[PDB]
Amino acid sequence: SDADVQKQIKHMMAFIEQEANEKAEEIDAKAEEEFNIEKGRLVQTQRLKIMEYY
Amino acid sequence: LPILQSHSALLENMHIEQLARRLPARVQGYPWRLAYSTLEHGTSLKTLYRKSASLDSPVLLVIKDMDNQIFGAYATHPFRFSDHYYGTGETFLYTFSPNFKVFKWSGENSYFINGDISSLELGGGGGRFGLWLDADLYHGRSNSCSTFNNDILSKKEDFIVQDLEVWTFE
């Protein structure tokens, strides 16, 4: 019995750690993407108002 | 050998020949249909998304600026409003400058297409876009972005659209 329980604990633990590593990587990927979108939108919006004003 | 189109206006046969050599296997041997043209349908980004909303195949974007340079993109997905970047690595930017150049994916990032209520843009990597267009399809901008490693697609970084077309393979 107990060796199968140790395997079940090891599998569940490894899935929890693997899922945490994937979720951390996704949150970091979205952090860089939404930085690119927001920075680009913000600079390009104000740059156009300055261009029409001058 | 040259492809079949249901009409045309920004492209001459020497532009058709050089584009049709580069389009992916997905769209080789399909007739080209004009989904949107500023000269047929009036000029706005809301009309461009409205005409594109029914589509489910790749598109070719063609732009002529006020300096008469021809450029645009081939895109794997129709131009739609999206919260996040979308598309795949068969997307490319192109220009006739006056010689034909095509800027395929660098492999660096997947920032291919992004559409907003007030703009449409392609590429990313910091504040850069390979191609950005305003809500009016009046002002646009092009600069080198690391998605494509492109040149300036127009004669200038900042440009005015003279006219614009979206073609679909269908």
Place this chain on the structure above:
Amino acid sequence: TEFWLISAPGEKTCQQTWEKLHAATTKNNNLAVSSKFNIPDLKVGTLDVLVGLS
């Protein structure tokens, strides 16, 4: 021509597992042509999804 894809765990490093099979099937007994086959680091989802995807 019929191929077989197979897969087996790395005994410490994946190259040792391939060296054992290439020896057993291609070098010594001439039973098959064989090679490595390249699969990228695809994203494992979660156990509840993988048992559906099969």
Place this chain on the structure above:
Amino acid sequence: KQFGPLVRWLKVNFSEAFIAWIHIKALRVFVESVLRYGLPVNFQAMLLQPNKKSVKKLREVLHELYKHLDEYYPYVYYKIDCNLLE
């Protein structure tokens, strides 16, 4: 007029469909190796092309290599059968 373009479309789209099929084989080998072996993903996929009249000898060699991992076989396995026109 229809023949030449129809042939070109068939040659292009056979290549597209075959390329797509071998990607599904890579997915099935991945998914079933993640299910059958340990979750720290460290398997080697291998492609074999058997000689004719040699099948039993090769099955027995593969079984002798991998019996300690325990149709069914003690390793992940798929055939690819490239004889499309029967």
